[PDB]
Amino acid sequence: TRECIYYNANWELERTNQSGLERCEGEQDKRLHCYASWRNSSGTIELVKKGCWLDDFNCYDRQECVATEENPQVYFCCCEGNFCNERFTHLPEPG
Amino acid sequence: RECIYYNANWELERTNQSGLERCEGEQDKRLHCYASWRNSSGTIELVKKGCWLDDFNCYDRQECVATEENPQVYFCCCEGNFCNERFTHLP
Amino acid sequence: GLECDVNICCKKQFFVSFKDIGWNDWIIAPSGYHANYCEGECPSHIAGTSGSSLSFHSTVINHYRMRPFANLKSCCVPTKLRPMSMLYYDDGQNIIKKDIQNMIVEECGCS
Amino acid sequence: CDGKVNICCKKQFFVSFKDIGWNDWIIAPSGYHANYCEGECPSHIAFHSTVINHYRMRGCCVPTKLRPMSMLYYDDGQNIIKKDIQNMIVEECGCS
């Protein structure tokens, strides 16, 4: 099924790895997505988390990971498809 | 857990007649196999074999032993892999 | 507490014998099961709270509450159920083995 | 639901995090349809299900089915956490 890129900046306190893949689980009917999140205050990206994300209509049929909020403090994108969160961009939209 | 699978009613149910079944279960619970059969004056006719979710009736049983003495259709369950490959009646 | 012995919402141990309700003519196995049920009072001990303090869902309702959910009441209900295998005769008298969801009440809590 | 009986049923309700005050700690989603059950039980109109109600004809309105949801949010120590929360979205209601 669905594999996603996995990143946890908080690996230390939760006890995970920092970097990998994550294999997605979700019961029969439902979609499975990938996600990324990051900061960017001053031009330099600071990864927060990447991983699997449960069935969510805001992710339905998005093949690339594109954050769409106007001007967030934390950027978030979600997508469908294997390793879809390998790359991520920001493409703001009115809101 | 894995179990012997058998389905005498395979045609109508549109399954395979025989094989294995890998059992799946939630997190905190036991897995069991079952068998079921008719015994019509000295001759066994298999009804169904497969997996069986947690039931107390099956607990710490290595053996598949019939629960009842003279029912029209006999049932046993057991714990462990392929413990429903053969079975027995009560006394 | 959460398991019963006449009190707060709790889980009551109960065994249903299919022979006792007439269903042993269509059910082959099991001959009954521990269905259990929930019973008891739904008190308000914890300030700033309706029912379960851990449920996001009822914390959102609870928050939207304190500014069209005045009319709401809390019962003692199942919070966790577990499936059971059954071997039975369907209404054409074919023998079926099925995993039936939501058969056994494993835990109770106030809604 | 029905204009004639007060039956137990699912009512829609979208949660906006920016409305309630929760957008400062919740990054994603901006919100969602956290429905709710209202109506009157037991049901006379329309499997524990049946053992119950069948012992009942002879002897509350609540979520009978729910969807989990992922959330990215700030925890108490100001760290970003992602959790898959159970029982967030009522899909169906019924009488206990």
Side-chain angles (χ1 to χ4, degrees), chain A residues 2-26 29-40 42-72 74-95, chain B residues 1-21 23-62 64-91, chain C residues 1-5 7-49 51-64 66 68-70 72 74-111, chain D residues 1-3 5-18 20-37 39-49 51 54-55 57-96:
Chain A
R2 198 80 99 238
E3 288 146 2
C4 284
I5 301 295
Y6 183 78
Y7 191 79
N8 195 11
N10 195 49
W11 62 276
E12 198 170 348
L13 300 155
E14 320 202 283
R15 294 92 51 79
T16 66
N17 336 286
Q18 196 169 353
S19 180
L21 305 175
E22 192 183 17
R23 277 148 235 257
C24 302
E25 284 180 73
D29 229 305
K30 271 94 189 182
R31 312 221 198 176
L32 323 112
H33 308 282
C34 302
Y35 87 97
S37 53
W38 71 97
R39 282 186 163 79
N40 178 347
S42 273
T44 289
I45 286 150
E46 180 210 274
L47 264 154
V48 173
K49 291 202 186 257
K50 302 187 179 177
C52 293
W53 182 267
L54 293 180
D55 186 302
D56 180 343
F57 81 102
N58 287 308
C59 319
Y60 285 7
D61 298 319
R62 294 171 138 277
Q63 249 54 51
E64 322 184 3
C65 211
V66 179
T68 56
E69 299 289 353
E70 272 206 300
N71 177 27
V74 181
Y75 293 76
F76 169 95
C77 63
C78 57
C79 54
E80 280 200 85
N82 283 333
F83 305 122
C84 64
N85 64 349
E86 190 211 309
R87 274 351 176 98
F88 55 86
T89 48
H90 175 321
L91 219 54
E93 271 146 54
Chain B
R1 192 118 311 143
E2 292 183 304
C3 296
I4 297 300
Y5 181 74
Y6 179 89
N7 191 5
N9 209 28
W10 66 271
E11 286 227 15
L12 237 211
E13 263 190 332
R14 287 159 258 168
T15 74
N16 301 287
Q17 173 177 20
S18 281
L20 307 188
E21 183 169 21
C23 314
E24 7 200 355
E26 326 143 77
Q27 334 180 18
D28 311 337
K29 328 284 189 232
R30 295 178 208 206
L31 290 147
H32 300 128
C33 310
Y34 81 101
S36 69
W37 78 97
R38 296 209 183 71
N39 184 343
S40 131
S41 51
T43 298
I44 293 175
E45 178 225 69
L46 267 185
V47 166
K48 289 188 201 292
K49 276 166 184 224
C51 290
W52 198 265
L53 287 179
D54 175 73
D55 179 335
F56 87 127
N57 287 286
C58 315
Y59 288 176
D60 320 289
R61 268 135 205 242
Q62 295 138 80
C64 215
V65 183
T67 53
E68 318 282 356
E69 224 188 291
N70 214 32
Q72 177 174 327
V73 179
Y74 295 89
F75 172 93
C76 66
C77 61
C78 56
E79 227 171 333
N81 294 149
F82 313 105
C83 61
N84 76 335
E85 207 169 8
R86 319 213 131 179
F87 54 67
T88 44
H89 281 136
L90 248 359
Chain C
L2 180 88
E3 214 160 46
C4 295
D5 55 302
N7 204 217
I8 298 184
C9 176
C10 58
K11 199 223 357 219
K12 197 104 193 354
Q13 225 97 265
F14 191 71
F15 190 77
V16 175
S17 220
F18 290 135
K19 83 175 167 207
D20 287 9
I21 57 183
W23 297 4
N24 55 300
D25 50 23
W26 69 277
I27 292 161
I28 302 159
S31 71
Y33 73 109
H34 293 319
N36 302 328
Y37 55 103
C38 314
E39 221 188 25
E41 93 188 52
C42 283
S44 198
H45 298 212
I46 320 307
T49 243
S52 162
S53 103
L54 297 172
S55 165
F56 206 76
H57 194 285
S58 65
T59 303
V60 315
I61 290 344
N62 159 269
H63 202 137
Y64 243 125
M66 299 151 56
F69 335 97
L72 273 216
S74 293
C75 290
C76 190
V77 297
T79 38
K80 187 57 192 76
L81 313 100
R82 185 228 284 181
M84 207 181 80
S85 299
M86 215 165 77
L87 188 73
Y88 57 98
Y89 281 106
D90 75 9
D91 300 322
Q93 299 76 226
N94 308 116
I95 308 192
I96 307 290
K97 192 271 208 164
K98 221 179 266 285
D99 288 355
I100 315 300
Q101 297 304 313
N102 297 307
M103 297 290 271
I104 289 172
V105 168
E106 211 148 16
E107 245 104 83
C108 296
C110 290
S111 59
Chain D
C1 332
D2 175 12
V5 170
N6 315 331
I7 71 172
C8 180
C9 60
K10 197 207 343 184
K11 289 189 264 205
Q12 241 89 294
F13 190 79
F14 189 70
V15 189
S16 170
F17 291 126
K18 98 197 154 218
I20 69 189
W22 294 9
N23 64 330
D24 47 37
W25 68 283
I26 298 171
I27 303 123
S30 87
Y32 68 107
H33 302 108
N35 309 313
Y36 71 107
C37 303
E40 305 168 32
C41 290
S43 279
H44 319 215
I45 302 288
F47 191 87
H48 213 281
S49 301
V51 188
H54 164 253
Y55 265 106
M57 315 295 326
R58 329 174 171 209
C60 263
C61 191
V62 303
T64 46
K65 197 161 140 290
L66 315 81
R67 240 250 105 218
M69 194 175 94
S70 293
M71 287 223 330
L72 189 56
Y73 61 103
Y74 294 94
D75 74 338
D76 249 46
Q78 238 77 281
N79 290 314
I80 291 162
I81 300 320
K82 184 270 172 169
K83 292 296 165 147
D84 288 349
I85 306 165
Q86 296 291 358
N87 295 310
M88 290 278 276
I89 294 188
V90 185
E91 355 212 279
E92 279 199 308
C93 298
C95 289
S96 57

Coordinates of all heavy atoms in Angstrom, one line a residue, chain D residues 8-66, unseen atoms left out:
Chain D
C8 N -33.7 9.8 17.1 CA -32.2 9.8 17.2 C -31.5 9.9 15.8 O -31.9 9.1 15.0 CB -31.7 8.6 17.9 SG -29.9 8.7 18.1
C9 N -30.7 10.9 15.6 CA -30.1 11.1 14.2 C -28.8 11.9 14.3 O -28.6 12.7 15.2 CB -31.0 11.8 13.3 SG -31.5 13.4 13.9
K10 N -28.1 11.9 13.2 CA -26.9 12.7 13.0 C -27.2 14.1 12.6 O -27.8 14.3 11.5 CB -26.0 12.0 12.0 CG -24.5 12.5 11.9 CD -23.8 12.3 10.5 CE -24.6 11.4 9.5 NZ -24.0 11.1 8.2
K11 N -26.8 15.1 13.4 CA -26.8 16.6 13.0 C -25.4 17.1 12.6 O -24.4 16.9 13.2 CB -27.4 17.4 14.1 CG -28.9 17.2 14.2 CD -29.6 18.2 15.2 CE -29.7 17.6 16.6 NZ -30.8 18.2 17.4
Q12 N -25.3 17.9 11.5 CA -24.0 18.3 11.0 C -23.5 19.4 11.8 O -24.3 20.2 12.3 CB -24.0 18.7 9.5 CG -23.1 17.9 8.5 CD -23.8 16.7 8.0 OE1 -24.2 15.7 8.7 NE2 -24.0 16.7 6.7
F13 N -22.2 19.5 11.9 CA -21.7 20.6 12.7 C -20.2 20.7 12.3 O -19.4 19.8 12.7 CB -21.8 20.4 14.2 CG -21.5 21.6 15.0 CD1 -22.4 22.7 15.1 CD2 -20.3 21.7 15.6 CE1 -22.1 23.8 15.8 CE2 -20.0 22.8 16.4 CZ -20.9 23.9 16.5
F14 N -19.9 21.7 11.6 CA -18.5 22.0 11.3 C -17.8 22.8 12.5 O -18.2 23.8 13.0 CB -18.4 22.9 10.0 CG -17.0 23.1 9.5 CD1 -16.3 22.1 9.0 CD2 -16.4 24.4 9.6 CE1 -15.0 22.3 8.4 CE2 -15.1 24.6 9.1 CZ -14.4 23.5 8.5
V15 N -16.6 22.3 12.9 CA -15.8 23.0 13.8 C -14.7 23.9 13.1 O -13.8 23.3 12.4 CB -15.1 22.1 14.9 CG1 -14.4 23.0 16.0 CG2 -16.1 21.1 15.5
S16 N -14.8 25.2 13.3 CA -13.7 26.1 12.9 C -12.8 26.4 14.1 O -13.2 27.0 15.1 CB -14.3 27.5 12.4 OG -13.2 28.5 12.3
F17 N -11.5 26.1 14.0 CA -10.7 26.3 15.1 C -10.5 27.8 15.4 O -10.5 28.2 16.6 CB -9.3 25.5 14.9 CG -9.5 23.9 15.0 CD1 -9.1 23.1 14.0 CD2 -10.1 23.3 16.1 CE1 -9.3 21.7 14.1 CE2 -10.3 21.9 16.2 CZ -9.8 21.1 15.1
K18 N -10.4 28.6 14.4 CA -10.3 30.1 14.6 C -11.4 30.8 15.3 O -11.3 31.8 16.0 CB -10.0 30.8 13.2 CG -11.3 31.5 12.5 CD -11.1 31.8 11.0 CE -12.4 31.8 10.2 NZ -12.3 31.2 8.7
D19 N -12.6 30.2 15.2 CA -13.7 30.6 15.9 C -13.5 30.4 17.4 O -13.3 31.3 18.1 CB -15.0 30.0 15.4
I20 N -13.5 29.1 17.8 CA -13.5 28.8 19.3 C -12.3 29.3 20.2 O -12.3 29.1 21.5 CB -13.5 27.2 19.4 CG1 -12.2 26.5 18.9 CG2 -14.8 26.6 18.7 CD1 -12.3 25.0 18.9
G21 N -11.2 29.8 19.5 CA -9.9 30.1 20.2 C -8.7 29.1 20.0 O -7.6 29.4 20.5
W22 N -9.0 28.0 19.3 CA -8.0 26.9 19.2 C -6.9 27.0 18.1 O -5.9 26.2 18.1 CB -8.7 25.6 19.2 CG -9.5 25.3 20.5 CD1 -9.7 26.1 21.6 CD2 -10.1 24.0 20.9 NE1 -10.4 25.5 22.5 CE2 -10.7 24.2 22.2 CE3 -10.3 22.8 20.2 CZ2 -11.4 23.2 22.8 CZ3 -11.0 21.8 20.9 CH2 -11.5 22.0 22.2
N23 N -7.0 27.9 17.2 CA -6.0 28.1 16.1 C -4.6 28.5 16.5 O -3.7 28.3 15.7 CB -6.6 29.2 15.1 CG -6.7 30.6 15.8 OD1 -7.0 30.6 17.0 ND2 -6.5 31.7 15.0
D24 N -4.4 29.1 17.7 CA -3.1 29.4 18.2 C -2.3 28.1 18.5 O -1.1 28.0 18.2 CB -2.9 30.5 19.3 CG -3.9 30.3 20.5 OD1 -4.2 29.2 21.0 OD2 -4.3 31.4 21.1
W25 N -2.9 27.0 19.1 CA -2.3 25.7 19.2 C -2.5 24.7 18.1 O -1.7 23.8 18.0 CB -2.5 25.1 20.6 CG -3.9 24.6 20.9 CD1 -4.9 25.4 21.3 CD2 -4.4 23.2 21.0 NE1 -6.0 24.6 21.6 CE2 -5.7 23.3 21.4 CE3 -3.8 22.0 20.8 CZ2 -6.5 22.1 21.6 CZ3 -4.5 20.8 21.0 CH2 -5.9 20.9 21.3
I26 N -3.5 24.8 17.2 CA -3.8 23.8 16.2 C -3.3 24.3 14.8 O -4.0 25.2 14.3 CB -5.2 23.4 16.2 CG1 -5.6 22.7 17.5 CG2 -5.5 22.3 15.0 CD1 -7.0 22.5 17.7
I27 N -2.3 23.7 14.3 CA -1.8 24.1 12.9 C -2.7 23.5 11.8 O -2.9 24.2 10.9 CB -0.3 23.5 12.7 CG1 0.7 24.1 13.8 CG2 0.2 23.9 11.3 CD1 1.4 23.1 14.6
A28 N -3.1 22.3 12.0 CA -3.8 21.6 10.9 C -4.8 20.5 11.4 O -4.4 19.7 12.4 CB -2.8 20.9 10.0
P29 N -6.0 20.3 10.9 CA -6.6 21.1 9.8 C -7.1 22.4 10.4 O -7.0 22.6 11.6 CB -7.8 20.3 9.4 CG -8.2 19.5 10.5 CD -7.0 19.4 11.5
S30 N -7.5 23.3 9.6 CA -8.1 24.6 10.0 C -9.4 24.3 10.7 O -9.8 25.0 11.6 CB -8.3 25.5 8.9 OG -9.6 25.3 8.3
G31 N -10.1 23.2 10.2 CA -11.2 22.7 10.9 C -11.8 21.4 10.3 O -11.1 20.7 9.5
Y32 N -13.0 21.1 10.8 CA -13.6 19.9 10.3 C -15.1 19.7 10.8 O -15.6 20.4 11.7 CB -12.8 18.6 10.8 CG -13.0 18.5 12.3 CD1 -13.8 17.6 12.9 CD2 -12.5 19.5 13.1 CE1 -14.0 17.5 14.3 CE2 -12.6 19.4 14.5 CZ -13.4 18.4 15.1 OH -13.6 18.4 16.5
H33 N -15.8 18.6 10.2 CA -17.2 18.3 10.5 C -17.2 17.4 11.7 O -17.1 16.2 11.5 CB -17.9 17.7 9.3 CG -17.8 18.6 8.1 ND1 -17.0 18.3 7.0 CD2 -18.5 19.8 7.8 CE1 -17.2 19.2 6.1 NE2 -18.1 20.1 6.5
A34 N -17.2 17.9 12.9 CA -17.4 17.2 14.1 C -18.9 17.2 14.3 O -19.4 18.1 15.0 CB -16.7 17.8 15.3
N35 N -19.7 16.3 13.8 CA -21.1 16.3 13.9 C -21.6 16.1 15.4 O -20.8 16.3 16.4 CB -21.6 15.2 12.9 CG -21.0 15.5 11.5 OD1 -20.9 16.7 11.1 ND2 -20.3 14.5 10.9
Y36 N -22.8 15.7 15.6 CA -23.4 15.4 16.9 C -24.8 14.7 16.8 O -25.5 14.9 15.8 CB -23.5 16.7 17.8 CG -24.5 17.8 17.4 CD1 -25.7 17.9 18.2 CD2 -24.3 18.6 16.4 CE1 -26.7 19.0 17.8 CE2 -25.3 19.6 16.0 CZ -26.5 19.8 16.7 OH -27.3 20.8 16.2
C37 N -25.1 13.9 17.7 CA -26.3 13.1 17.9 C -27.3 13.9 18.7 O -27.0 14.3 19.8 CB -26.0 11.8 18.6 SG -24.7 10.9 17.8
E38 N -28.5 14.1 18.2 CA -29.6 14.4 19.0 C -30.9 13.6 18.6 O -31.1 13.2 17.4 CB -29.9 15.9 19.0
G39 N -31.7 13.5 19.6 CA -33.0 12.9 19.4 C -33.4 12.0 20.6 O -32.6 11.9 21.6
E40 N -34.5 11.4 20.5 CA -35.0 10.7 21.7 C -35.0 9.1 21.5 O -35.3 8.6 20.4 CB -36.5 11.2 22.0 CG -36.5 12.8 22.2 CD -38.0 13.3 22.3 OE1 -38.8 12.6 22.8 OE2 -38.2 14.5 21.9
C41 N -34.6 8.5 22.6 CA -34.4 7.1 22.7 C -35.4 6.5 23.8 O -35.9 7.3 24.6 CB -33.0 6.7 23.0 SG -31.9 7.1 21.5
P42 N -35.8 5.2 23.7 CA -35.4 4.3 22.7 C -36.0 4.6 21.4 O -36.8 5.5 21.3 CB -35.9 2.9 23.2 CG -37.1 3.3 24.3 CD -36.8 4.7 24.7
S43 N -35.6 3.8 20.3 CA -36.2 4.0 19.0 C -37.5 3.1 18.9 O -37.4 1.9 19.3 CB -35.2 3.7 17.9 OG -34.3 4.8 17.6
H44 N -38.6 3.7 18.5 CA -39.8 2.9 18.2 C -40.1 2.9 16.7 O -40.8 2.1 16.2 CB -41.1 3.4 18.9 CG -40.9 3.8 20.4 ND1 -41.9 3.5 21.3 CD2 -40.0 4.4 21.0 CE1 -41.6 4.0 22.4 NE2 -40.4 4.6 22.3
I45 N -39.5 3.9 16.0 CA -39.7 4.2 14.5 C -38.5 3.6 13.6 O -37.4 3.4 14.1 CB -39.8 5.7 14.3 CG1 -41.0 6.3 15.0 CG2 -40.0 6.1 12.8 CD1 -42.3 6.0 14.5
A46 N -38.8 3.5 12.3 CA -37.8 3.4 11.2 C -37.6 2.0 10.5 O -39.2 1.3 10.9 CB -36.4 4.0 11.6
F47 N -25.6 -5.8 16.8 CA -26.3 -7.0 17.1 C -26.6 -7.2 18.6 O -27.6 -7.8 18.9 CB -25.4 -8.2 16.6 CG -26.1 -9.5 16.6 CD1 -26.8 -9.9 15.4 CD2 -25.9 -10.4 17.6 CE1 -27.4 -11.2 15.4 CE2 -26.6 -11.7 17.6 CZ -27.3 -12.0 16.5
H48 N -25.7 -6.7 19.5 CA -25.9 -6.3 20.9 C -27.2 -5.4 20.7 O -28.1 -5.5 21.6 CB -24.7 -5.4 21.4 CG -24.4 -5.5 22.9 ND1 -25.2 -4.8 23.9 CD2 -23.5 -6.2 23.6 CE1 -24.8 -5.2 25.1 NE2 -23.7 -6.0 24.9
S49 N -27.2 -4.6 19.6 CA -28.4 -4.0 19.0 C -29.5 -4.8 19.3 O -30.3 -4.4 20.2 CB -28.2 -3.9 17.4 OG -27.0 -3.1 17.0
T50 N -29.7 -5.9 18.6 CA -30.8 -6.8 18.7 C -30.9 -7.7 20.0 O -32.0 -8.0 20.4 CB -30.9 -7.8 17.5
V51 N -29.8 -8.0 20.7 CA -30.0 -8.9 21.9 C -30.6 -8.0 22.9 O -31.6 -8.3 23.5 CB -28.7 -9.4 22.5 CG1 -29.0 -10.5 23.5 CG2 -27.8 -10.0 21.3
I52 N -30.1 -6.8 23.0 CA -30.7 -5.7 23.9 C -32.1 -5.6 23.5 O -33.0 -6.1 24.3 CB -29.9 -4.4 23.7
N53 N -32.4 -4.9 22.4 CA -33.8 -4.4 22.0 C -34.8 -5.6 22.0 O -36.1 -5.4 22.2 CB -33.8 -3.7 20.7
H54 N -34.3 -6.8 21.8 CA -35.2 -8.0 21.7 C -35.4 -8.5 23.2 O -36.5 -8.9 23.5 CB -34.5 -9.0 20.8 CG -35.1 -10.4 21.0 ND1 -34.4 -11.4 21.6 CD2 -36.2 -10.9 20.6 CE1 -35.1 -12.5 21.6 NE2 -36.2 -12.2 21.0
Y55 N -34.4 -8.5 24.0 CA -34.7 -8.6 25.5 C -35.7 -7.5 25.9 O -36.5 -7.7 26.8 CB -33.4 -8.7 26.3 CG -32.9 -10.1 26.7 CD1 -31.7 -10.5 26.0 CD2 -33.4 -10.9 27.7 CE1 -31.2 -11.8 26.3 CE2 -32.9 -12.1 28.0 CZ -31.8 -12.6 27.4 OH -31.2 -13.8 27.7
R56 N -35.6 -6.2 25.3 CA -36.3 -5.0 25.8 C -37.9 -5.0 25.5 O -38.7 -4.7 26.4 CB -35.7 -3.7 25.2
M57 N -38.3 -5.3 24.2 CA -39.8 -5.4 23.9 C -40.5 -6.5 24.7 O -41.7 -6.6 24.7 CB -39.9 -5.9 22.4 CG -39.1 -5.1 21.3 SD -39.4 -3.3 20.9 CE -41.2 -3.0 21.2
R58 N -39.7 -7.3 25.5 CA -40.2 -8.4 26.3 C -39.8 -8.4 27.8 O -40.5 -8.9 28.6 CB -39.7 -9.7 25.7 CG -39.5 -9.6 24.2 CD -38.9 -10.9 23.6 NE -38.9 -10.9 22.2 CZ -38.9 -12.0 21.4 NH1 -38.9 -13.2 22.0 NH2 -38.9 -11.9 20.1
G59 N -38.6 -7.8 28.1 CA -38.0 -8.0 29.4 C -38.9 -7.6 30.6 O -39.8 -6.8 30.5
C60 N -30.4 6.3 25.6 CA -29.8 7.5 24.9 C -29.3 7.5 23.5 O -28.6 6.6 23.0 CB -28.5 7.9 25.6 SG -28.4 9.2 26.9
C61 N -29.4 8.7 22.9 CA -28.9 8.9 21.5 C -27.4 9.3 21.5 O -27.0 10.3 22.0 CB -29.7 10.1 20.9 SG -29.4 10.4 19.1
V62 N -26.6 8.4 20.9 CA -25.1 8.5 20.9 C -24.5 8.0 19.7 O -25.0 7.2 18.9 CB -24.5 7.8 22.2 CG1 -25.1 8.4 23.5 CG2 -24.7 6.2 22.0
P63 N -23.2 8.4 19.5 CA -22.4 7.9 18.3 C -22.3 6.4 18.3 O -21.7 5.8 19.2 CB -21.1 8.6 18.5 CG -21.5 9.8 19.3 CD -22.5 9.4 20.3
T64 N -22.8 5.8 17.2 CA -22.6 4.4 17.0 C -21.4 4.1 16.1 O -21.0 3.0 16.1 CB -23.9 3.8 16.5 OG1 -24.4 4.6 15.4 CG2 -24.9 3.8 17.6
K65 N -21.0 5.1 15.3 CA -19.8 4.9 14.4 C -19.1 6.2 14.2 O -19.6 7.3 13.9 CB -20.3 4.4 13.1 CG -19.1 3.9 12.3 CD -19.7 2.9 11.2 CE -18.9 3.1 9.9 NZ -19.2 4.4 9.3
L66 N -17.7 6.1 14.4 CA -16.8 7.2 14.3 C -15.5 7.0 13.5 O -15.0 5.9 13.5 CB -16.5 7.7 15.7 CG -17.7 7.8 16.6 CD1 -18.0 6.5 17.2 CD2 -17.4 8.9 17.7

